Amino acid sequence: GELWGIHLMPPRILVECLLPNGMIVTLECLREATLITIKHELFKEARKYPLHQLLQDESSYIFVSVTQEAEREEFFDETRRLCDLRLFQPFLKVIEPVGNREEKILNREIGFAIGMPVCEFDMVKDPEVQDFRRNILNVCKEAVDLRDLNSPHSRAMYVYPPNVESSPELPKHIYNKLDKGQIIVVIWVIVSPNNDKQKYTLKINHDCVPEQVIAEAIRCVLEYQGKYILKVCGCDEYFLEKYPLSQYKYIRSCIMLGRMPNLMLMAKESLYSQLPMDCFTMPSYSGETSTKSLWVINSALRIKILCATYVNVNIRDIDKIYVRTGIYHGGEPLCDNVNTQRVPCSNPRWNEWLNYDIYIPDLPRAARLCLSICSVKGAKEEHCPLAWGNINLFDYTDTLVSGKMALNLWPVPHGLEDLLNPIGVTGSNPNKETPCLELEFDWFSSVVKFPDMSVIEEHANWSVSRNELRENDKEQLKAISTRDPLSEITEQEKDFLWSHRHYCVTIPEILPKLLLSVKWNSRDEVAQMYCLVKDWPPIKPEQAMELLDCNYPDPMVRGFAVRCLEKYLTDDKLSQYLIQLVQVLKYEQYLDNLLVRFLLKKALTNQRIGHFFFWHLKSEMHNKTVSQRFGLLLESYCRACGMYLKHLNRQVEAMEKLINLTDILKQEKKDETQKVQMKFLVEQMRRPDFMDALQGFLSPLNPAHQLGNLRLEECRIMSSAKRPLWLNWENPDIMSELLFQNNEIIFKNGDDLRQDMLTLQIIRIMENIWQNQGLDLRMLPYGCLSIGDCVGLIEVVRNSHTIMQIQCNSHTLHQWLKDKNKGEIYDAAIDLFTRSCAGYCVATFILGIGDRHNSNIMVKDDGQLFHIDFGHFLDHKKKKFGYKRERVPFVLTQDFLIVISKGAQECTKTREFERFQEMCYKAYLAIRQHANLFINLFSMMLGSGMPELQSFDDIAYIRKTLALDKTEQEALEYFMKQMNDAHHGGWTTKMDWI
Amino acid sequence: MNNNMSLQDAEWYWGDISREEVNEKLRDTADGTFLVRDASTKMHGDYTLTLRKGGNNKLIKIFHRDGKYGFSDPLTFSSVVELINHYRNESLAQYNPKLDVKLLYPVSKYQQDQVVKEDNIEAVGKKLHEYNTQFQEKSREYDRLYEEYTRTSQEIQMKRTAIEAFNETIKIFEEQCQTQERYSKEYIEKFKREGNEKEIQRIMHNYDKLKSRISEIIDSRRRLEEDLKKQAAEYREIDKRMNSIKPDLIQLRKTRDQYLMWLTQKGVRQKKLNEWL
């Protein structure tokens, strides 16, 4: 709301103003009135009141009040409207401004973007936090310096980074689309004050740098090139780096789509001055025990469970409660889990030392205590987690935990039935009104530290002290290496892999397998692994990312993985995988680690990455498990991102107003007609304060797209009960008409869009896989961004229609498509339809998304079919049902086969259908061969809190659909088998009479 | 007696089931729990043995060459039933001293026989349909409770920061009491001597309105606290109900699944199963 308990304040309202002479003066006001207006009218009536004798001029005073976030806020921007003040209650205090005004204004801006006041970090006792807050700045500082290493070109590369592919090589069927390896390309320029546009159609080589394109235009060659830079017409996308032209994403897809590239010439100096040169200010916050080593303590690990404050359990329904406990390294227990005795629900008290089969010096660095309080209800009985909590056995300074501590536990995530949650975050619940478990660790007359690397190598040599690699072996290493990240290795394979650990360096990508063969509960073997990891060859980023999931918690392993990313991960692929990399931060034991340093640095040296870095972090701020971590991270970013914070604040402000509006629609107007809801909406949007917020800002879907004036007459609510908003902005680029005149975005508030965000990411990666192999199977991964708790944006796809919209007899679809393309362009459309169909058919089967129907499926004018509304994937409705089978979400009815068969009535038997069949077959195998990437991507998401992605068991569905336990030949037959079943025999097998 | 029985009749033999199914069967089980499945067709080996040891699942592959079976060369067992029966009576320390455990607890494919012996395919396929609807009814019961749970947890969070915002506000209005009190011990004293009761009157009127405003805001905060306690109790109550549904839910699913496996043997038309669902 815009005042506590209230969604919108009335046109007028009274305000208790509290003068510095202790007076209290009411004041009639307007909701859009500004502070300057308020102060003026306030001091007016102040003269009506006692003792205005001691009142100075307004110029000497400022306004202060309380916000919704319970912070005492000082309003320096006295042009800000009363309804945008975010007052808790409608009162204002007027006092003498004091202290660094700059820091205070920045602080409140960061806190606004961050969704929480920075001052809440100040009063955090925990040292790891304050250590993070200070240390992380070193990276921020380091970042802004890389941004000036070559000013002013360094400045522009940050704000307008080249949007390029990873490699300048073109796949064969992309090069084949050029004219003799050349591309037709249109350039425009400003003429006079009237600034009219004019064509200069070029036809140059694809491998050309922007310099050449800049050169040719004028038709002193090396004279005036560096006077100008190229811009994309419609976007704020630029060409600042010496990349081959065809390596830019926009050019590449133009080539791909058969679209003609339209660039705009612009004075290099004209942009370089639009750059703020934004500087970065250092914020204000800028025992003689002789510590023992961990390896010196000859003791078995034991932990004491004392008591729990309470659990929420009906005393009638549950027999006993107990504490379940485990020592975990990642997701694997290091020894047997140990329960406490069973006690009544009415008195949760234990006071028993639990003993574990682990010798203290054998505790690995990443070891964790995982616990939960469990309820228990012939001899058969059921066991259920009531609340859970995880604890790092070592803190961020390598100190072993000791003595009494309290642990406030967490709610069990929906659908989780494991008695323990080793994948959950560690540390206590910040909410103290919650079940609290007391425990005691041994204290060892001292402070216990995990050994330094020096001592670890020391022990590594000793361990080992106290051969031709045969061909037989050499092939088994290959075989093992080809297993997918969830194909468990056998004990024979572990023993073998370990025995040949030294030879394994020859074949570096087997590192995940080798790390799984290490006895992690033995310092001997771990010490030896550390040495190997120290000098290990780097591996491809796609494989390095495997090592960042919850199954490789060890900092050395993670360290190597991060280091692989520093060298080999391009910004293009970084953008592609950003969702998972951010999600994986939840697996990190500590606030300070190499990955967060690497990510923050990238976010601060590339505005495009920083943009989505911000949003993915922000979207989860409501989630109290990562609130602190992400909040801290966000403060760092916002402090050092320079001018973009202002751009980001307009995005946050615009979204918050869309949130307030849809809130009002959903609860305060749930039983009003759509027709009256729209008119309400319109009246609100019409207001000056709204038009200021909702116009002239950057699209969070794509920061290169500027959203200008709202076309309010064409904005609509939609049919769903969530009341999604169909919004329409003017594209205010002066070259607008050459790309798109208007931007349409669906604002949805009420549904989880993360699943769709994920599904669409995957689809893009799939299309990418196929393209790099000569399979032009064109997909439509439209924009979808989660920006908060069940709040997000969806890009509208223009010139598309549902299948039903066509239908409303099995020949109509082909007939429609025919009319829309009638002529020599008919075969570039039955084509596009067929390819599209193959990709989405294979993609939806592998992923197991929700059942397709005539609203689920859409077609563009030019033939391209795509899907929308994925919601559920990996067959999540496997919970209600009980079947093991793998659905085929997208069955091709005669309607589609007829379109594929260009009209033919024998559509299951034709050169066309069988040609279509081979496309799917090739697409399927293509993905199966890149199974690792997809399994790894899914594995990084297990902590996300997505109901469909809680356990490794959930990811097992694509091992099934990709038949990874099977042979490649069997995998194809399996696919065919699945199609024939769904298409009721009507999917012609290799059993055909020719 | 034992060793002559066919592998196909052996209880711990499940044939072609996946590592995943094996995983659910083995979760949270005691050491020595085990079962044998067909090896994956892409690797070498005929069968994989999976056992519990120290909280983990151990996968040990069983190979075959020329009539003989084993974990490694030399292969010295005559049949799989023989191999297994050996280690049901001898610790696997013999094969690997690092693996001290024997194969104590089989996982029967005739285990469903204990919870159901009921014989008619349709007497079972109707109980399944009944347990299933019992299950989905409780499923929805628990889901509705979960949306109350989240909605309530959030509103409590809203209320809590509102309490904090009320306290900051009360703090200010009381500092405005100090600002008013302090700025008057002399500027009212000077109208006391001279008896300017004229003006004293409307300072008191102003001071009173300050006290009056303080008082009403403390009422509001007080009313919010009672609403907070009320809703916190609603929340804890909600959490109790879910905790009574949880055990019944798992069992209902466990029971339904058992009946799904029993109907998977006897190979029921999977289109029948769908109508039974």
Distance (Å) from the alpha carbon of A20 to chain B's nearest alpha carbon: 7
User: Do B55 and A326 make contact, defined as CB atoms within 8 angstroms?
Assistant: yes
| Distance (Å, whole) CA B274 – CA B271 | 5
Q: Check the CA dihedral A732-A735-A739-A741 and report its sign.
A: positive
The amino acid at A298: N
Experimental method: X-ray
User: Do B41 and A966 make contact, defined as CB atoms within 8 angstroms?
Assistant: yes
ω before A553 within 30° of 0 (cis)? Answer: no
A264 closest CA partner among A304, A213, A312: A213
Instruction: Quickly name the fold that domain A642-798 has.
Output: 3.30.1010
How many residue pairs bridge chain A and chain B with CB atoms within 8 Å of each other?
172
Which H helix or E strand runs over A726?
Answer: strand A725-730
3-state DSSP assignment of residue A392: strand
Q: With contacts defined as CB-CB under 8 Å, which chain A residues touch B199?
A: 50
Q: With contacts defined as CB-CB under 8 Å, which chain A residues touch B146?
A: 414
Q: With contacts defined as CB-CB under 8 Å, which chain B residues touch A965?
A: 18-19, 40-42
- Sheet with A800-802, strands from edge to edge, namely A800-802, A857-860, A865-867
| Distance (Å, whole) CA B14 – CA B18 | 10
The DSSP secondary-structure symbol of A460 reads H
The amino acid at A573: K
Q: With contacts defined as CB-CB under 8 Å, which chain A residues touch B164?
A: 70
| Owning domain of residue B158 | 119-277
Q: With contacts defined as CB-CB under 8 Å, which chain B residues touch A477?
A: none
Domain limit, last residue, from B118, B139, B154: B118
Label residues A574-600 b or e (16+ Cβ within 10 Å = b). Answer: bbbbbbbbbbbbbbbbbbebbbbbbbb
| Distance (Å, whole) CA B10 – CA B6 | 7
Q: At what angle do helices A594-603 and A627-640 cross, to 10 degrees?
A: 40
**A668 contacts: CB under 8 Å, gap ≥ 6:** A7
Domain with residue B9: its CATH number is 3.30.505.10
A176 exposure class (CB count in 10 Å sphere: 0-12, 13-18, 19+): exposed
Matching fold, domains A1-294 and A443-641 = no
Distance (Å) from the alpha carbon of A349 to chain B's nearest alpha carbon: 19
3-state DSSP assignment of residue A825: coil
Residue to substitute from B17, B26, B42, B252, interface A, most A β-carbons within 10 A: B42
| Cβ atoms of A580 and A941 closer than 8 Å | yes
Smallest Cβ–Cβ distance between B240 and the set A314, A879, A885 belongs to A314
Q: Check the CA dihedral B229-B233-B238-B242 and report its sign.
A: positive
Classify domain A443-641 at the CATH superfamily level.
Answer: Phosphatidylinositol 3-kinase, accessory domain (PIK) (1.25.40.70)
The DSSP secondary-structure symbol of A451 reads P
User: Do A337 and B246 make contact, defined as CB atoms within 8 angstroms?
Assistant: no
User: Do B162 and A4 make contact, defined as CB atoms within 8 angstroms?
Assistant: yes
> A799-994: what CATH class?
mainly alpha
Q: Please tell me whether residues B141 and B238 are part of one structural domain.
A: yes
Smallest Cβ–Cβ distance between A22 and the set B176, B241, B243 belongs to B176
The DSSP secondary-structure symbol of A705 reads S
User: Do A491 and B232 make contact, defined as CB atoms within 8 angstroms?
Assistant: no
B98 closest CA partner among A964, A499, A23: A499
Domain with residue B169: its CATH number is 1.10.287.1490
> A871: which 2 tokens?
């919601």
Q: What are the domain boundaries of chain A? A: 1-294, 295-442, 443-641, 642-798, 799-994
The DSSP secondary-structure symbol of A665 reads I
A551 closest CA partner among A395, A328, A358: A328
The DSSP secondary-structure symbol of A871 reads -
User: Do A89 and B71 make contact, defined as CB atoms within 8 angstroms?
Assistant: no
The amino acid at B70: G
A428 closest CA partner among A114, A126, A117, A789: A126
Residue recorded with tokens 């001091």: A43
Q: Please tell me whether residues B128 and B55 are part of one structural domain.
A: no
User: Do A51 and B217 make contact, defined as CB atoms within 8 angstroms?
Assistant: no
Domain limit, last residue, from B60, B91, B118: B118
How would CATH label the architecture of A295-442?
Sandwich (2.60)
User: To what resolution in angstroms was this structure determined?
Assistant: 2.6
User: Do B247 and A375 make contact, defined as CB atoms within 8 angstroms?
Assistant: yes
Residue to substitute from B44, B152, B169, B199, interface A, most A β-carbons within 10 A: B169
DSSP annotation string for A488-537: PPPHHHHHHHHHTTTGGGGSGGGHHHHHHSS-TT-HHHHHHHHHHHHTPP
**B61 contacts: CB under 8 Å, gap ≥ 6:** A490, A492, B39, B43, B44, B45, B47, B48, B49, B71
| Distance (Å, whole) CA A837 – CA A361 | 58
User: Do A965 and B203 make contact, defined as CB atoms within 8 angstroms?
Assistant: no
User: Do B277 and A883 make contact, defined as CB atoms within 8 angstroms?
Assistant: yes
Domain limit, last residue, from B84, B118, B152: B118
Q: Report the 10 Å Cβ neighbour count for B76.
A: 13
Distance (Å) from the alpha carbon of B1 to chain A's nearest alpha carbon: 31
Domain count, chain B: 2
> A1-294: what CATH class?
alpha beta
Q: Check the CA dihedral A233-A234-A239-A243 and report its sign.
A: negative
Q: Please tell me whether residues B131 and B228 are part of one structural domain.
A: yes
Strands B56-65 and A62-66: what pairing? unpaired
A87 to chain B: nearest residue by CA? B165
**A2 contacts: CB under 8 Å, gap ≥ 6:** A8, A9, A31, A83, A84, A86, A660
| Cβ atoms of A68 and B161 closer than 8 Å | yes
A16 to chain B: nearest residue by CA? B213
